[PDB]
Structures are given as structure tokens and as C-alpha cells.
Amino acid sequence: MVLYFIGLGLYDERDITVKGLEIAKKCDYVFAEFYTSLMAGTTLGRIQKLIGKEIRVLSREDVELNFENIVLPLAKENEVAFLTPGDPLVATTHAELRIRAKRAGVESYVIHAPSIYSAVGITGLHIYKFGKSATVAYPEGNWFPTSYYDVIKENAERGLHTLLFLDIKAEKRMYMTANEAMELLLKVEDMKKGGVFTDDTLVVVLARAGSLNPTIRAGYVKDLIREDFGDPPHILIVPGKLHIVEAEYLVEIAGAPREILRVNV
Amino acid sequence: MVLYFIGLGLYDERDITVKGLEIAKKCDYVFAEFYTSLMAGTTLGRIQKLIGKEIRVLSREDVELNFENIVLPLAKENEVAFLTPGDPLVATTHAELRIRAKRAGVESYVIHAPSIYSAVGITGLHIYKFGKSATVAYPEGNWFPTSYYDVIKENAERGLHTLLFLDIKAEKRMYMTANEAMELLLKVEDMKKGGVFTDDTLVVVLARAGSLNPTIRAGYVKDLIREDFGDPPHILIVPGKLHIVEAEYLVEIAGAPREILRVNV
């Protein structure tokens, strides 16, 4: 009669909360999805070993089209868990699944976990200064989406930071790198000429948040565009004007050039 | 030779990540602060029991004025942890403590935990649509803070949602309720008269996120301003223009008036 939405956290199998782990262990059935994002620091096998239960992986179609036929029937008569990377319901489509549960007469509860949305706090940028967020999507064929560029423009215009989620082909386990994202933005700039993203733009790269050894780097596009930030996932941030405290953290912790202390504050 | 900043999560001792717990258990010394937020579902005793170590609680003064005298000295020759509610670097000034660690020759690492900043996803509002955030502070003396009102105005004009952290006076055991926040906002409205926050404004209240049964309510200020949302902590949200799916969730899960289903495109 109960369905638990449980977040797995940021990077590896230990990023699930103690609460999430203990609940998952007591569930009769455990499902999971790895299409909204991936857990780059672990494997399905290691997650299963930790929970001590077999985990049935569900595809985007399994969930979006058949959640009520695959998960809910069992949840109607058993304790069922649905694991998701990060924090449950951060992904836009997940919230609606709680309505499906209600419709099916199944109670649902949410067990939170760390999300990259809040983990960016490790960049030293004040969380309250982050504005609207966006996703940089790989262009393909004759389709060249650029709305994320406008998001940066609108946030920066108001002195706000912009969190940019990078494209991920979960199924093929292919991650867009911060370098590729920078190249794309420069490409968009060359087309819109809005003066939003150039070689002189200050950016922050956060790779493998959740790991004990994440890569946190800050600097100008011209210098970071070909830098190796390590293994994915990568997150790109275009900060707005900086509070001196933010700038000093970027210099001391993220290796930012001293120049930001006078140019970006 | 190391200092770990470890988040404890939203509501109780089990909201810590497994990673955080396993590291905390092996630390030589464990410190913590409980003034940045309120964990309404646990006690110091229960936290100490789970970690299996004595925890020295620090006051805001101990941290802000003497972190480098109380914590860092021991971190030079031992493995030390500093625990905080939620995520240690979200809506706190703790990021700066990493700079103090560096100058003291102490390596620091961050272990994230669920944060209210991302937990708001449980309200059904799309996380990417949240704009700049703000804090509703208790007026004191002749000083009546109002900057949060302008944040709401700015986000709303862009169609973005506004997350409002609520004030907390840990030493006085005072935790601002959503009701008190709405009352303060109505007063600022009368002063500035910008048509930003009135009795007809739709708001969302999330109380005790992290618990299994948090209070999630949506409705007009005139109807919710005197409603009992249960024990603190509380957070208030002022949505911008809603997507149809957001409205459906607010109606089905947060008990909002079904009239909001009729979005004005």
C-alpha cells in the first residue's frame, strides 16, 4: 500500500541517506530509473549490494507510459521503493507520478537526498543569488536550440548566477563536457551577438559533485575552454557580479585568477 | 590533517548520507552548529548515538569569531568533522570557513545532505523555474527589513517562483512561521503598494520537509494566513505563472483551490 520515492544522491552508492537506505532495505520490491541522470561514481551492482535487494531498472517509457502498470500494482499490496539519482522530484516529470499513485489509491512518501541544485553551494557562490536554471542541449540536424543562452542573459542582467545542467544521453552513457558547453555558448554568442558569453566571461566548473575529490575551477572562458576537468559529470555555471566573499572563495578554493577580484566584483 | 563539513539533512538524524555517517564515525573529534536551521525530528542525543561520538556544539559566536581557535587546531593533527543541519554550504556563511581551514594548513572536504533549497521540489513546482531566493527577517527596533519583497517582485515579473527562507533565532528558540511571514509581507505591500503580495496572492507552504509527512499547502493568502501548518521549520514560496502540471499537483497534493487549474496563458 506504500510507494517510497528515494533519492540516491550525487555520485556514488553512499550518497543515499541513512533514511533512504533503511527504508529501501525493508521494501518488498525496489525499482529505479537512470534516465533523468546517472550515478557516475558507482554501478547498479554496487547499489544492489548496498541495499541487499534486486533492483529492477525502468526506462523512460516504462515510467512515463507505464508507471501505473509496472510499479503501482505491486505498491498497492506491498512496500515498494522507486530510486532516482539526486533528490526525488527535482526532475520535472517525477512530481506527476505522485498523482498517479493517488489515483491508484497508493500512498506515497518522499525521501530526499543531495541534489546538484543545492550541491553547487560548494562553488562558494551564494545559493540565494542563483536565478532561473537551464540545460545546455547538444544541437542536432537542423535543430539548434539556444534558450539557455537567454536564461544566462536574463539572470546576469539582474546580477544573478546561472546554473547550467549539461546534456546527458543516459541510455548511451554519454556526458556533455564543460568544454563542449563552452564551445556551444561561444557559438551561440557568435550568432546572437548579445555580449552574454565571450572569451572574457568568467565561468565556474564543478565536476563530480558528491565525490570527496570534485574538481572546482573558476576562470575566464579563454583559459578554461581547453582545460581538463576530469571525468563527468560536469556542471557549468556563469556567475553574475560577485560579492567579494564569493570571489575570494573562487580564488582560494577554485584557483580563480586574482583578476576576478577587481573585474567581477 | 583534515576537516570535514558534513550535512545532517532536513529533519532527523537519518537524513545524513551514508557517506557522511561512515566518515563521521571514524573522526577523532566532532563539532556541530544548530543555529542555521532547525531539525525538528531529532535531538543531539540521537545524533550522538548514531555517530557514536561526543558532539561539541558551537554557538554562532564560537563559529564566526573563533572557528580557527576551537576547531582548526585539532584538525591539524586529527580527522575532524563539523556537522550542520541541511547542507553545510546552503544559505549559510560556512563556505568562508574553508578559507580559514586553508590558511591554517588544514585540508577540508564537503559531504552534502538534503537541503530545503532542493526539497521544495516536493511542492510540485518545477525547480528550474525558481529565481532569486530571499530571507524574511524579523523586524527589530526601528529596522524593518523589506528587500525580500523586491525579490518576489523581480522574479514574478519574469514568471519565476520565489523561495523564501524564514528567520530563526536559535538561542531564543524562535522560528518564524509561514503565517508570520505572510503578515510581514502584507505590511510591506501596504507600504510599497506594488501589487506584489496581497490577500489574493497564491502561495505555497512547506513545513518540516524531510519528515515522512510534511505539511504541503497551497492557496490564497487570505485563506492560509491563519491556517495551522504545524510545528516549525516552515518555508514560504510565492509561485510565478504556473505550468498546467504544476497547478495539477498543487490541487491534487497540496489541496489548492481547483480554480487555479485554469491558467491564464
Ligand SMILES: Nc1ncnc2c1ncn2[C@@H]1O[C@H](CSCC[C@H](N)C(=O)O)[C@@H](O)[C@H]1O
Ligand atoms: N525541513 C525543513 N522544512 C521547511 N523549511 C526548512 C527546513 N530546513 C530548513 N528550512 C528553512 O530554511 C531556513 C534555514 S536556512 C539554512 C538551510 C540549510 N543549510 C539547508 O540546506 O536546508 C529555516 O529557517 C527554514 O525557513
